[PDB]
Write a protein that binds this ligand. Structure first.
Ligand SMILES: Cc1ccc(C(=O)NC2CC2)cc1NC(=O)c1cnc(-c2ccccc2Cl)s1
Length: 337
């Protein structure tokens, strides 16, 4: 057991071992607060996350076990992986703090579009890596649900890593079915997000930069028109169907007229991506196979995930029960070489 040292960062109590040094807060990191630190041991720049009130609510205690289980299973280049997990606790009886350690990422895609248009080969490399990462996550029966440039991490070499997966001016990449309560969703809700992101990289501007839920939707549709005949029947919700008919009937717009000068194959993929029909929306594996990624697509170098036991998700257990399962996952952790 290493020696732990206490410090106060923006009125937060941080008790970390005698290896993580010069802790400086960076951003957010779902269900917690993130710090940039220097790991003695390896001599690397790492990211340290302190989970916020891990065992204070039923939703938190369940989410804490969920997050730790995900990080211990993720073994992929385009997916954030777990380097270390610690607690200032000696016994189960004093376990009320959880810390997660990962590699420190250079930047996020919110700055990688900020004020300049990207080259077509740059977009190709970024989107191919998002898709490769999503393919692996989806094969484990996990979906991001809140995919945005904020949780897409890049380094100096443009080597991408997906963050904050499987836990869920912000909802600008939200899919129409998981917003307008349409047909019982699938994994391609993330393909919609990939589509909105790809468009943003090429144009340099956000595709649907709404101000509220009503605006966001009018904007999505000022480009895909209104659902037509075969699709209007598929809509399950009695409430939201009243709004679709309330909207002025918009036609489907040509993506070549909005994405001017852009690669014809990039237009085709975006059109196969930004499909209102969740049933006909292209999958991560199918989108990798698309002609646009001819230079990068390798079926032999696009691995699928090992079986992920998610049976705990159907389990309704008490805080102290979830607290116990988490503690065993902290002590059973094998650090990667
Ligand atoms: C430390 C940590 C803990 C958990 C998760 C995570 O994704 N958990 C979900 C269950 C799957 C991610 C990180 N890791 C980070 O949150 C960051 C690493 N580097 C970051 C960064 C630093 C400076 C500038 C830009 C970035 Cl993107 S944030």
């Amino acid at each position: 057991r290493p020696t732990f040292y206490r410090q106060e960062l923006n009125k937060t109590i941080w008790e970390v071992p005698e290896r993580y040094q010069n802790l400086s807060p960076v951003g957010s990191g779902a269900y917690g607060s993130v710090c940039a630190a220097f790991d003695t041991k390896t001599g690397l720049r790492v990211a340290v996350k302190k989970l916020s009130r891990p065992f204070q609510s039923i939703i938190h205690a369940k989410r804490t076990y969920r997050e730790l289980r995900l990080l211990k299973h993720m073994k992929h280049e385009n997916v954030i992986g777990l380097l270390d997990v610690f607690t200032p606790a000696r016994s189960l009886e004093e376990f009320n703090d959880v810390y997660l350690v990962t590699h420190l990422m250079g930047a996020d895609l919110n700055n990688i579009v900020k004020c300049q248009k990207l080259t077509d080969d740059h977009v190709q490399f970024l989107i191919y890596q998002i898709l490769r990462g999503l393919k692996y996550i989806h094969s484990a029966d996990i979906i991001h649900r809140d995919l945005k440039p904020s949780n897409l991490a890049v380094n100096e070499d443009c080597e991408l890593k997906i963050l904050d997966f499987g836990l869920a001016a912000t909802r600008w990449y939200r899919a129409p079915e998981i917003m307008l309560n349409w047909m019982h969703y699938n994994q391609t809700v993330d393909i919609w997000s990939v589509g909105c992101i790809m468009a943003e990289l090429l144009t340099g501007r956000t595709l649907f930069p709404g101000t509220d839920h009503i605006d966001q939707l009018k904007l999505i549709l000022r480009l895909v028109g209104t659902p037509g005949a075969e699709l209007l029947k598929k809509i399950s919700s009695e409430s939201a169907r009243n709004y679709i008919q309330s909207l002025t009937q918009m036609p489907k717009m040509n993506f070549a007229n909005v994405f001017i000068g852009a690669n014809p194959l990039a237009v085709d993929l975006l059109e196969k991506m930004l499909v209102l029909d969740s049933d006909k929306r292209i999958t991560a594996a199918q989108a990798l196979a698309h002609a646009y990624f001819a230079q990068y697509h390798d079926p032999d170098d696009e691995p699928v995930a090992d079986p992920y036991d998610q049976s705990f998700e159907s389990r309704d257990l008490l805080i102290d029960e979830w607290k116990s399962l988490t503690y065993d996952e902290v002590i059973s952790f094998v650090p990667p070489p």
